[PDB]
Design a protein around this motif. Sequence first.
Motif, PDB file in Angstrom:
ATOM      1  N   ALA A 184       0.869  -1.209   0.000  1.00 35.42           N
ATOM      2  CA  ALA A 184       0.000   0.000   0.000  1.00 35.42           C
ATOM      3  C   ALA A 184       0.889   1.237   0.000  1.00 35.42           C
ATOM      4  O   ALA A 184       1.679   1.440   0.889  1.00 35.42           O
ATOM      5  N   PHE A 185       0.799   2.036  -1.023  1.00 36.89           N
ATOM      6  CA  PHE A 185       1.680   3.232  -1.119  1.00 36.89           C
ATOM      7  C   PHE A 185       0.917   4.527  -0.824  1.00 36.89           C
ATOM      8  O   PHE A 185      -0.294   4.558  -0.743  1.00 36.89           O
ATOM      9  N   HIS A 186       1.646   5.605  -0.705  1.00 31.92           N
ATOM     10  CA  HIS A 186       1.034   6.936  -0.460  1.00 31.92           C
ATOM     11  C   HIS A 186       2.116   8.001  -0.705  1.00 31.92           C
ATOM     12  O   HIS A 186       3.272   7.823  -0.359  1.00 31.92           O
ATOM     13  N   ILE A 187       1.761   9.088  -1.337  1.00 33.84           N
ATOM     14  CA  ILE A 187       2.773  10.144  -1.640  1.00 33.84           C
ATOM     15  C   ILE A 187       2.571  11.328  -0.698  1.00 33.84           C
ATOM     16  O   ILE A 187       1.481  11.564  -0.221  1.00 33.84           O
ATOM     17  N   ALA A 188       3.608  12.072  -0.412  1.00 31.66           N
ATOM     18  CA  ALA A 188       3.430  13.230   0.525  1.00 31.66           C
ATOM     19  C   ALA A 188       4.120  14.496  -0.002  1.00 31.66           C
ATOM     20  O   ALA A 188       5.326  14.549  -0.115  1.00 31.66           O
ATOM     21  N   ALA A 189       3.370  15.528  -0.284  1.00 33.59           N
ATOM     22  CA  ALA A 189       3.991  16.803  -0.763  1.00 33.59           C
ATOM     23  C   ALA A 189       2.898  17.821  -1.102  1.00 33.59           C
ATOM     24  O   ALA A 189       2.831  18.870  -0.490  1.00 33.59           O
ATOM     25  N   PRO A 190       2.070  17.496  -2.066  1.00 31.56           N
ATOM     26  CA  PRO A 190       0.973  18.380  -2.493  1.00 31.56           C
ATOM     27  C   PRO A 190      -0.204  18.245  -1.526  1.00 31.56           C
ATOM     28  O   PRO A 190      -1.261  17.800  -1.905  1.00 31.56           O
ATOM     29  N   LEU A 191       0.003  18.617  -0.282  1.00 38.65           N
ATOM     30  CA  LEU A 191      -1.050  18.521   0.788  1.00 38.65           C
ATOM     31  C   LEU A 191      -2.461  18.256   0.231  1.00 38.65           C
ATOM     32  O   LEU A 191      -3.030  17.217   0.504  1.00 38.65           O
ATOM     33  N   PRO A 192      -2.998  19.186  -0.524  1.00 42.67           N
ATOM     34  CA  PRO A 192      -4.348  19.036  -1.098  1.00 42.67           C
ATOM     35  C   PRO A 192      -4.334  18.102  -2.319  1.00 42.67           C
ATOM     36  O   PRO A 192      -4.488  18.539  -3.442  1.00 42.67           O
ATOM     37  N   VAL A 193      -4.169  16.820  -2.111  1.00 42.02           N
ATOM     38  CA  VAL A 193      -4.170  15.880  -3.270  1.00 42.02           C
ATOM     39  C   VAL A 193      -5.545  15.234  -3.397  1.00 42.02           C
ATOM     40  O   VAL A 193      -6.061  14.661  -2.459  1.00 42.02           O
ATOM     41  N   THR A 194      -6.131  15.302  -4.555  1.00 42.76           N
ATOM     42  CA  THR A 194      -7.460  14.668  -4.754  1.00 42.76           C
ATOM     43  C   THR A 194      -7.311  13.467  -5.690  1.00 42.76           C
ATOM     44  O   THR A 194      -8.188  12.631  -5.791  1.00 42.76           O
ATOM     45  N   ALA A 195      -6.202  13.371  -6.374  1.00 47.62           N
ATOM     46  CA  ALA A 195      -5.989  12.228  -7.300  1.00 47.62           C
ATOM     47  C   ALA A 195      -4.503  12.115  -7.653  1.00 47.62           C
ATOM     48  O   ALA A 195      -3.787  13.098  -7.722  1.00 47.62           O
ATOM     49  N   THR A 196      -4.043  10.917  -7.884  1.00 47.95           N
ATOM     50  CA  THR A 196      -2.612  10.711  -8.247  1.00 47.95           C
ATOM     51  C   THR A 196      -2.542   9.633  -9.330  1.00 47.95           C
ATOM     52  O   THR A 196      -3.477   8.882  -9.529  1.00 47.95           O
ATOM     53  N   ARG A 197      -1.448   9.542 -10.026  1.00 50.31           N
ATOM     54  CA  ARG A 197      -1.327   8.506 -11.082  1.00 50.31           C
ATOM     55  C   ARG A 197      -0.053   7.703 -10.853  1.00 50.31           C
ATOM     56  O   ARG A 197       1.029   8.127 -11.190  1.00 50.31           O
ATOM     57  N   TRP A 198      -0.173   6.542 -10.283  1.00 53.56           N
ATOM     58  CA  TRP A 198       1.034   5.714 -10.029  1.00 53.56           C
ATOM     59  C   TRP A 198       1.330   4.861 -11.250  1.00 53.56           C
ATOM     60  O   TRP A 198       0.606   4.869 -12.227  1.00 53.56           O
ATOM     61  N   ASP A 199       2.372   4.099 -11.179  1.00 53.08           N
ATOM     62  CA  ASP A 199       2.714   3.197 -12.299  1.00 53.08           C
ATOM     63  C   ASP A 199       3.346   1.954 -11.693  1.00 53.08           C
ATOM     64  O   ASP A 199       4.481   1.973 -11.259  1.00 53.08           O
ATOM     65  N   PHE A 200       2.612   0.880 -11.616  1.00 52.06           N
ATOM     66  CA  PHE A 200       3.185  -0.340 -10.982  1.00 52.06           C
ATOM     67  C   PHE A 200       4.067  -1.091 -11.977  1.00 52.06           C
ATOM     68  O   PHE A 200       5.235  -1.315 -11.733  1.00 52.06           O
ATOM     69  N   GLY A 201       3.519  -1.504 -13.084  1.00 60.74           N
ATOM     70  CA  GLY A 201       4.338  -2.263 -14.072  1.00 60.74           C
ATOM     71  C   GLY A 201       4.262  -3.761 -13.753  1.00 60.74           C
ATOM     72  O   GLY A 201       4.956  -4.566 -14.339  1.00 60.74           O
ATOM     73  N   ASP A 202       3.405  -4.138 -12.838  1.00 64.75           N
ATOM     74  CA  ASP A 202       3.256  -5.577 -12.477  1.00 64.75           C
ATOM     75  C   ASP A 202       2.045  -6.131 -13.226  1.00 64.75           C
ATOM     76  O   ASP A 202       1.275  -6.910 -12.699  1.00 64.75           O
ATOM     77  N   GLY A 203       1.831  -5.674 -14.422  1.00 64.17           N
ATOM     78  CA  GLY A 203       0.626  -6.091 -15.178  1.00 64.17           C
ATOM     79  C   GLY A 203      -0.281  -4.865 -15.202  1.00 64.17           C
ATOM     80  O   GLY A 203      -0.901  -4.545 -16.196  1.00 64.17           O
ATOM     81  N   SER A 204      -0.309  -4.146 -14.101  1.00 66.69           N
ATOM     82  CA  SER A 204      -1.108  -2.899 -14.028  1.00 66.69           C
ATOM     83  C   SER A 204      -0.134  -1.731 -14.182  1.00 66.69           C
ATOM     84  O   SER A 204       0.499  -1.302 -13.236  1.00 66.69           O
ATOM     85  N   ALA A 205       0.021  -1.235 -15.379  1.00 61.05           N
ATOM     86  CA  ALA A 205       0.981  -0.118 -15.605  1.00 61.05           C
ATOM     87  C   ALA A 205       0.440   1.172 -14.991  1.00 61.05           C
ATOM     88  O   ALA A 205       0.691   1.471 -13.833  1.00 61.05           O
ATOM     89  N   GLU A 206      -0.290   1.931 -15.765  1.00 56.87           N
ATOM     90  CA  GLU A 206      -0.861   3.217 -15.268  1.00 56.87           C
ATOM     91  C   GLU A 206      -1.697   2.962 -14.016  1.00 56.87           C
ATOM     92  O   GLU A 206      -2.300   1.917 -13.862  1.00 56.87           O
ATOM     93  N   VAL A 207      -1.714   3.896 -13.105  1.00 54.89           N
ATOM     94  CA  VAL A 207      -2.480   3.691 -11.846  1.00 54.89           C
ATOM     95  C   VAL A 207      -3.295   4.935 -11.493  1.00 54.89           C
ATOM     96  O   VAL A 207      -2.763   5.917 -11.031  1.00 54.89           O
ATOM     97  N   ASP A 208      -4.585   4.892 -11.670  1.00 53.10           N
ATOM     98  CA  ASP A 208      -5.421   6.068 -11.300  1.00 53.10           C
ATOM     99  C   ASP A 208      -5.808   5.936  -9.825  1.00 53.10           C
ATOM    100  O   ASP A 208      -6.767   5.274  -9.483  1.00 53.10           O
ATOM    101  N   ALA A 209      -5.050   6.536  -8.946  1.00 46.63           N
ATOM    102  CA  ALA A 209      -5.358   6.417  -7.491  1.00 46.63           C
ATOM    103  C   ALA A 209      -6.053   7.678  -6.978  1.00 46.63           C
ATOM    104  O   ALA A 209      -6.077   8.706  -7.631  1.00 46.63           O
ATOM    105  N   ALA A 210      -6.616   7.599  -5.799  1.00 44.71           N
ATOM    106  CA  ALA A 210      -7.316   8.772  -5.211  1.00 44.71           C
ATOM    107  C   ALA A 210      -6.378   9.497  -4.242  1.00 44.71           C
ATOM    108  O   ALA A 210      -5.513   8.891  -3.625  1.00 44.71           O
ATOM    109  N   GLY A 211      -6.551  10.790  -4.109  1.00 48.26           N
ATOM    110  CA  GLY A 211      -5.685  11.586  -3.190  1.00 48.26           C
ATOM    111  C   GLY A 211      -4.232  11.165  -3.369  1.00 48.26           C
ATOM    112  O   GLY A 211      -3.849  10.698  -4.422  1.00 48.26           O
TER     113      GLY A 211
END
Length: 80
Positions: A17-44
């Motif tokens: 379970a990951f989480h990013i910290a910097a843009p305090l007001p985050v409503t959406a983020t885009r991760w990239d796993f590459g484990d079959g699920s490349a692009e990642v549309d995550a919340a906050g």
Amino acid sequence: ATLVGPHGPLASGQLAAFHIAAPLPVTATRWDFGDGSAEVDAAGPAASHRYVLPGRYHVTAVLALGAGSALLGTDVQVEA
């Protein structure tokens, strides 16, 4: 942004379970796993990696605040 990727052991078939910290007001983020699920549309500033193969993985993320963003890039090592 800071790369906070909390999780227990990462064996083949684990959900980290990951989480990013910097843009305090985050409503959406885009991760990239590459484990079959490349692009990642995550919340906050949070998401999670679904690793299923035994080996190594690479992670990256894009923060979206609407007027600001952030670049993430973590590493992963799953065993079996």
